[model samples]
Target: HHHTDPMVSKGEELFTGVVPILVELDGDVNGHKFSVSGEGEGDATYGKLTLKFICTTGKLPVPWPTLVTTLVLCFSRYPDHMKQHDFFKSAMPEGYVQERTIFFKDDGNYKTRAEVKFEGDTLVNRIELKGIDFKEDGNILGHKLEYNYNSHNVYIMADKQKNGIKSNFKIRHNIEDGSVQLADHYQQNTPIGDGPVLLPDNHYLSTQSKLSKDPNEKRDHMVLLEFVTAAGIT
Candidate 1:
């Protein structure tokens, strides 16, 4: 829109049907924004999209997840059709998940990215949803198992404080149904990857509205959850 100071160029239209897909930039840094996906596509197909951090300095911050991303995630599953659909249980079983908002880059000497793998009916920690995409929009559309597809997500890791190297798995539950969305991607300008440092704004924080001065007054557990349903393009 360019209506604001740091404008985002209309990068491209990866797909243009059903749910539609669009890519836009923010301020010209390493940030990418996209649109929702359509219906009738595969379940998990986004497996080759790349978002170059491009930033040579500073640590990355976690991003906020949005619903618009869900819209663009209408994916297709054509790559692993012959593969079995059985869940593989590891240290963390079917419902095992772990994610982080901040991470250390080992002074750029270490190479790290979220890894995920699907074996039988279980998962074996695959790859970070931020670095790859199927068609282009990188919206978590196809082949990006949204839920129950054997999932174990690990976002950040630093030499792992010894016992902490066990690798953790966090659950990103669905806002409406309490069900966890297997795939982790966002459409809005929220925190993701490395941490909030990659957000449209440099001052990103890992938090929800529950800690506000007068939050609706929720309980202890409900604090980490959110009913997300909207996202910005630029």
Candidate 2:
């Protein structure tokens, strides 16, 4: 590249070609519908990142039973570049679990580190990943969803992270959406349960919330890249 900056050219464009670098994200969260995914790759020195929740919208009841919720976030990176925080999880049900992190601070710039588990216990193991800022003329691409465990939180969409022409985004929040405020402050005076509830809407119903790039696929599927120079980044 031309040297680099912009988070090291976005970690060197996830170390180009061969494989690993399938970052995906799909619209809505409070208006129902959601999706987020990832896979990374790198070379010359070191790199690796995996994250997935992969789909949302479990028929509503907000208590998630099974709509295929598989949580994962394996990590290890000596840096192809970008780094600030990245330790994550949320795999609930049966064996239950909840732990999260994915930070990148700035002011009008971030808040997406989550917490609040279930079942085997770990509900709110210390929390605070909430903010909304983006609009220095806004180019768009702002989102945060920490699943506030029924307290309701996870509804930020700045849009314009494009591809496939279908745009109409706008919701920029510097903080204060109150996902649901613990299910509207516990029904009325403290008392909430039933799980999954994300009501912090501001917009979305047309233009489909935006984010697409699927031209018959293969920008380098599965991801490997000579195993990233055989496992080394230079």
Candidate 1 local lDDT, 1-234, one digit each (tens): 121211111111111122212222121112443221111221122321111111112221122232212111112211222111111111112222222222111110111233322234322332222322123222232222222222222222222222122223233434334434433321111112221121121111121212111155232111111121112112
- The per-candidate count of clashes, in order, stands at 55, 14
Model 1: weakest 10-residue lDDT segment is 82-91
lDDT for 126 in candidate 1 is: 26
Could you give candidate 2's per-residue lDDT for residues 114-190 as a string of tens digits? Answer: 22232232112212222244333222222332221111122222222310011121222222254311110100001
> Would you list the C-alpha lDDT of every candidate in the order shown?
0.21, 0.24
lDDT of 1 at 119: 38
**Lowest summed-lDDT stretch of 10 residues in model 2?**
182-191
Best by the TM-score measure: 2
